[PDB]
Design a protein around this ligand. Sequence first.
Ligand code: CL
Ligand code: CL
Ligand code: CL
Ligand code: CL
Ligand code: MN
Length: 340
Amino acid sequence: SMTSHSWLCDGRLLCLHDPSNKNNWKIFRECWKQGQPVLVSGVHKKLKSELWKPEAFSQEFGDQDVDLVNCRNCAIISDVKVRDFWDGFEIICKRLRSEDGQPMVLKLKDWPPGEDFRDMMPTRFEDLMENLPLPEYTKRDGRLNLASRLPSYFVRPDLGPKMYNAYGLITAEDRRVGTTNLHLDVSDAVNVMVYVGIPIGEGAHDEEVLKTIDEGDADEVTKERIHDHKEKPGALWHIYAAKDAEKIRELLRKVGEEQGQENPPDHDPIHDQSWYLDQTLRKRLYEEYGVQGWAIVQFLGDAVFIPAGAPHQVHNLYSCIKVAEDFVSPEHVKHCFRLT
Ligand SMILES: [Cl-]
Ligand SMILES: [Cl-]
Ligand SMILES: [Cl-]
Ligand SMILES: [Cl-]
Ligand SMILES: [Mn+2]
């Protein structure tokens, strides 16, 4: 039977089932006011799927110049063509190679650049913004979005959306690396999985995806979504409550010292965006600092709501296209205020 919602993370995570339900706000707002993230499934079924394929991004924009990042080592690959990224998205043999002659795991940096999404891709912008869940919170002019209503005493987000495009991580060594490192934002965000590309040529790395989710600390209901429904899994997230950020800073300052980094006692390891919390660091955060997170697997069409001030990291299981919009909910406006 169709249901309004379910729970993940052993009851700590709301999952809404109908992205366009005019009553979602009544369930959402009680979880959101406590500083929890929220998951909304099924947004892919509202979108024009032909607008979100990698082949169409290559055909229409392939001649633009861009930089990429090598996710394994943080190296920047300067001033290449955007088709060099898209044409290897799903076909491994077509990927750029490192000196070792392996195909690289790559992320496309800042594309479309700055606030240009709307200008470059007007039809995609319409399709996304018209189908965001919780529209009174997430639309530019929604009645519960304060982004356009605050004076300069508050940090206001840029005009979005922002696109996040990157290959999936592959090997047992890759399990310790991020697509996006641990960091926080002063605004609220909604991030949608609009496309998941499951490769071919070295397509058979299905078993290291299972070990990654297991060791990622995912719940038994999330493990059922794979085996039972055959939905396409994109990315493994870890999110932490805004109130735990300083304990996470304290762990990461201790670890930097142990690893002979040399840093002033005040420096901000979260703001540096230089860390990925692997199984060892997550266990140490729980045991030694008493901090528990939410481990979330974002499938095709899932929308992740990230609260202002919440530290978070992302690890792509397969090749993904994500589109995110920032907003300022009244519940969390404290987090972008410039005083006390
Ligand atoms: Cl809060
Ligand atoms: Cl467009
Ligand atoms: Cl709403
Ligand atoms: Cl990063
Ligand atoms: Mn982010």
